[PDB]
Every structure is written in C-alpha cells, then in structure tokens.
Amino acid sequence: LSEVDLEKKIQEEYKLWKQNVPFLYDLVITEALEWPSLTVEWFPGSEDNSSIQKLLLGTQTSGNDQNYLQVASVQLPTLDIVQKIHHEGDVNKARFMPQNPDIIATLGLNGNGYIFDLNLYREQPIVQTGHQACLRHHTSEGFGLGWNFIQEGTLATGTEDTSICVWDIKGKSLSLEKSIDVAPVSVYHRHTAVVNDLQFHLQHEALLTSVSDDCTLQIHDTRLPSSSSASQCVKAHEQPVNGVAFNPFNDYLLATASADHTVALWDLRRLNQRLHTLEGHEDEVYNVQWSPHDEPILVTSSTDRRVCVWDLSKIGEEQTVEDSEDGAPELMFMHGGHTNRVSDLSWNPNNKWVLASLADDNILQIWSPSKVIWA
C-alpha cells in the first residue's frame, strides 16, 4: 500500500488501458481542465455526421481564485469553454432547470444556493455580474441539489449542516441590476449527519428522496410541514450513503451508492428489504445514475477510480467460473480511464451510450463503450 508505488501501479495500468481503448470504446475524448470541476451535466439538444453539444461544468479553486460556472461545447460524431460566469466559492454542484435549461441552480460558498439565468447574457464569453439570486439558509457547504420535474421553479438542497431546504423561484424576476435573496419554502431536519444527495421523483410533484452519512434512505412528502415526519425512513447501509437515483422508466425502482463499496437496489413498496446488491467496486461508491435510454442500465463511480456500467437484466444469469472470476453477470462494462477518484458523471441524453465523467485530477472524459459490447 505504498504511496509512490500505488501511483506507479496506476500509471502502468493507465498506459495499458490506453493501448486497449480500440477494443473497448467507440469514442474517447480526454480534456485537461485548468481547475478541477466537481460537477458535470449534459445540456439537452445539439447543433459531417457530427454535432456540437454542451456541458455544464464548474471550478474548484479552493479560495485561490475567482470561481466560474462554465458552459463547454464539444464536437461529437454520430472540447472548449465557451462561457464563464463569476461564481462565489467552489461550484459544488450545478444543475439546469429541466423545464428551461437557461435557468441554472448551484451550491456554493458556505452552502448558499445560487440561481443563474443564461438568457440575460447569451453572447458574453465572460460574465462578471455573477448570479441573479442567492438561496440563503444553509450554514455549511454541501452537494445535495435537485430540481422538481413537475412543479417548475421548485428545487431542493441538502448540505453538511444536515438540513434539507425546499425552494421556489417561480415568478421571481431576475435581472442584471442585482441579485435577489430567497428564503426557503420549507426546511426539514430529519438527518443526523451530512445530506449527501437528494432527488425529486420524475412523476410526482411532492416526492423527494434523500441519503446521508447517517446511513438512512428517506422519502419526504413536500406537501407536509416540517413538524411532520419523513414518509419513509430506513437504514439503507451500515456505512454512509453517498448517492441516490430514481429509475426514469420504473417509478418504484431506485438505487443507493454507499461507502461500503456497494450499490443497493430498492423498490419503494418494500424499503424494509433490499432488492439486490451490486458488488464489484473496491472502495466507496459515490455517484449513481440511471441511463435515460435503457431501463435496466445504470452507471456508478467510485474512489477506486473506476466507472462501472451495470445491466440489471443479467442478474442471476449463470456463469462458468471462467467468468465468475472477472465479475457479476450484471457488470457490463468498466471504465478504467481515470487515474483518480471520480467526482461526478452524466449520461448524454442526446446520443446513445455517451457518458461524461470527472476525476479529482482536473480530467474530464467523454466516452462511449463499444457497440460490440452493449449490443
């Protein structure tokens, strides 16, 4: 477990991985960022059998410099920074409002939320004005952020202060004249340690899920006041739960990523008993994201520096020990291109099987596993 020797191993394996790319990928794009980004999200839409698409990125300068919220464009077959907007503190997370992608929410300095309206400055390569609204309740930084898919303008945040705030920005006028302050519509105190991740249900106005270092998975009904209890609350793992994600096809299915190196699958109608356990990561699992194109497909990321793609439809398939040696049947693909902990990842909603992933060493990768493998 030597430090400079582990690095030696990492660099050897990465070299080998680079030689094997033509056997594993249809597409690999690697971009070294000036600063690390903690967040990445594909924008919907596109503009020689190629197209130009956009990503939402951030910076982490850690107090050393001006931070920016960033929009990048990339040319994909079927990377450069085109806009930088002043941001307060590290961009811990950045998500576009699904009903209108010009509206961006972020989590920044001291756990302030921020709102940006990209429509007020389409042409400016650099936007010095910064944010149009500041969401002011949280007292510690955090990474839990998600928009409501049914009720436009509603979003939620969760941070290290262990609270969850629900916000509503519908109808609030934004302009370059100044930033407005926004107070939460609700704040819930239902966790006993940092809220790591949270998500609104795709098909329900008031169903919010959250996970925490306190090991619980909770379901909240946002129509109820904070005096009320969580609608559902179970211990999901024995160790911190880092991510949570609803399946976009199956309204009862969700996944949790835990520090116990596993991903657990759950049905809302039976949270007292896990559906299945995905094993194969060697360290804390952080990110979990369902494919927006294929119901049984999800992707996870880990401190073990790997991104695994899983196929739930292969669960329980029989295996000659000649393959029981190299992974669970449901483990469809492993991305070994990152040489450090993976920070965030995003399915491209525009193209089949295209992913973006970020690691702690300033590397953004855009990749597509070989059709020879997924077909």
Question: Domain segments of the chain: what residues?
Answer: 1-375
Amino acid at the residue 189: H
Resolution of this entry, Å: 2.3
Return the closest-CA partner of residue 222 out of 134, 139, 155.
Answer: 155
- Sorted by sequence, the CB contacts under 8 Å of residue 258 that are 6+ apart come out as 236, 237, 239, 240, 241, 242, 264, 284, 285
Residue 371 is encoded by which pair of tokens? 């059709």
Please state how this structure was obtained: X-ray
The answer to whether residues 14 and 363 touch, using CB atoms and an 8 Å cutoff, is no
Q: Taking the alpha carbons of 330, 336, 339, 343 in that order, is the dihedral positive or negative? A: negative
Burial 188-202 (b: 16+ CB within 10 A, else e): bebbeebbbbbbbbe
Q: What CA–CA distance (Å, rounded) separates 92 from 108?
A: 6
Count other C-beta atoms under 10 Å from residue 317's C-beta: 11
Q: In this structure, what token pair is assigned to residue 102?
A: 């010009």
For residue 200, give the H/E element and its range.
Answer: strand 195-200
Cα–Cα distance, 350 to 156 (Å, whole number): 26
- Please, are residues 325 and 337 in contact by the beta-carbon 8 Å criterion? no
Listed in sequence order, the DSSP H helices in the chain are 3-24, 321-324, 371-374
One-letter amino acid for residue 121 of the chain: Y
Using DSSP's 3-state secondary structure scheme, residue 99 falls into coil
The residues, ordered by sequence, that sit 6+ positions from 148 with a Cβ below 8 Å of its Cβ are 154, 155, 156, 200, 205
Q: How far apart, in Å, are the Cα atoms of 369 and each of 66, 264, 276, 323, 332?
A: 36, 24, 25, 20, 10
d(C-alpha 77, C-alpha 231), whole Å: 45
Q: Which residues contact 322 (CB under 8 A, 6 or more apart)?
A: none
Decide if 209 contacts 219 (C-beta within 8 A): yes
Give the E-state strand segments of 201-341 in sequence order: 207-212, 216-221, 232-235, 241-246, 253-258, 263-267, 276-278, 285-290, 297-302, 307-311, 331-335
Identify any residues that bridge with 195 across adjacent strands, giving them in sequence order.
212
Name the residue with tokens 């302009």.
Answer: 175
Interacting residues of 109 by C-beta distance below 8 A, sequence separation 6+: 88, 89, 90, 141
- The strand pair at 186-188 and 363-369 is best described as unpaired
Three-state SS at 88: coil
Structure tokens at 232: 């559902």
d(CA 50, CA 52): 7
Q: Which of 127, 102, 126, 103 is nearest to 115 (CA)?
A: 103
> Ramachandran region of residue 305, left (φ > 0), alpha (ψ -120 to 50) or beta?
left
* Strand, helix or coil for residue 191: coil
Burial class (CB in 10 A: 0-12, 13-18, 19+), 178: exposed
Distance CA 302, CA 93 (A): 17
CATH homologous superfamily of domain 1-375? YVTN repeat-like/Quinoprotein amine dehydrogenase (2.130.10.10)
